Every structure is written in C-alpha cells, then in structure tokens.
Amino acid sequence: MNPPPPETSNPNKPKRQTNQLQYLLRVVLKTLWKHQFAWPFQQPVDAVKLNLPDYYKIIKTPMDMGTIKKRLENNYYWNAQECIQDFNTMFTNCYIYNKPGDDIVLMAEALEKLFLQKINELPT
C-alpha cells in the first residue's frame, strides 16, 4: 500500500523566510498549482486508489506538490535549492514510472516547462 507522506515539518531544523522562498510559494508553486494539469501532482501518488501495485517498488523517493506546498508553508526549506530539487524529483519520478506519450507524462512535461520559466525569474 502507500508509505507515509514525506515529512513536511522538522522541529530540529531552524527556520528562515527569504525573498526566494516567498517567491517559490507565491509565484512558482501557486502558478503550477492552478494549472489545468495540476491535480495528479497535488498530493502523494495513491497507489491503492489508482491501482498501481508496483509504484512504490519503482519509486523510492516520492514527491508531490502538496508536500512542496506544505514544506513552504511550514518553512521546512532553509535553502531554495531544496525546493527546486523536490520539484525535479516529482517530474523525474513521473518519467521513470510512466511511458513516453502517456497523458500523465505530457502533463508533467507541460508543468516542468512552466516551472522552468518561473524559476528563471527567481529573485537574487
């Protein structure tokens, strides 16, 4: 069945709020979240509901935008790079599990293109 979702808080990790982290939530995450293709990426993959018996045999580092959103809201990220890495992991997992030309892969591709355009404008 499904694993616990990724951690979204770490009480032993200090917290800080920077312009880059704020931009990642209010601009990058929010724009992708509202995209027409966002829903499959808004929460952890549910292999039980979707009937994907080998998903968590193939994907050992799951990631999703619901987790990313909560991490940003909880100030889980100290470095902007941590958040960028999570988005990258989310897209890469989709490309690993699925096949070229699948609907979900085309959706990931569109979201990744938009992600790159938005992180291009990340403030200094």
Residue numbers in the entry: 43 to 166
Manuscript excerpt for this entry:
Reduction of c-Myc levels has been demonstrated following treatment with degraders independently targeting both CBP/EP30026−31 and BRD4.32−42 Here, we pursued a strategy of targeting c-Myc through dual degradation of both CBP/EP300 and BRD4, via the small-molecule inhibitor ISOX-DUAL 1(43). The latter inhibits BRD4 and CBP/EP300 with micromolar potency and was deemed to be a suitable candidate to assess whether a dual degradation approach would offer a synergistic benefit in the reduction of c-Myc, compared to inhibition or degradation of the proteins individually. We sought to rationalize the different affinities and ubiquitination patterns through the cocrystallization of representative degraders with BRD4 and the evaluation of the binding modes. Several high-resolution crystal structures (1.1–1.9 Å) of BRD4-degrader complexes were determined.
Cocrystal structures of the first bromodomain of BRD4 (BRD4 BD1) and CBP bromodomains in complex with 2(43,45) revealed two potential solvent-facing vectors for linker attachment: the phenolic ether and morpholine groups. We proceeded to synthesize a small panel of candidate degraders based on this exit vector strategy, using 5 as a key intermediate. Routine cyclization chemistry, involving the ester-acid lithium salt 11, led to the important precursor 12, which underwent amide couplings with a small range of amine-linker-E3 ligase analogues to afford candidate degraders 13–16. Good balances of affinity were observed for degraders 13, 14, and 16, albeit with a marked increase in CBP IC50 values, whereas compound 15 was less active toward both bromodomains. Degrader 14 bound with a similar pose to the parent scaffold BDOIA383, with the isoxazole oxygen forming the typical hydrogen bond with the highly conserved Asn140 at the bottom of the binding site, and the benzimidazole moiety packing between Pro82 in the WPF shelf and Leu92. The linker-thalidomide portion protruded into the solvent and was not resolved in the crystal structure. We can therefore rationalize the similar BRD4 binding affinities for phenolic ether degrader 14 and BDOIA383 (2.4 and 1.8 μM, respectively).
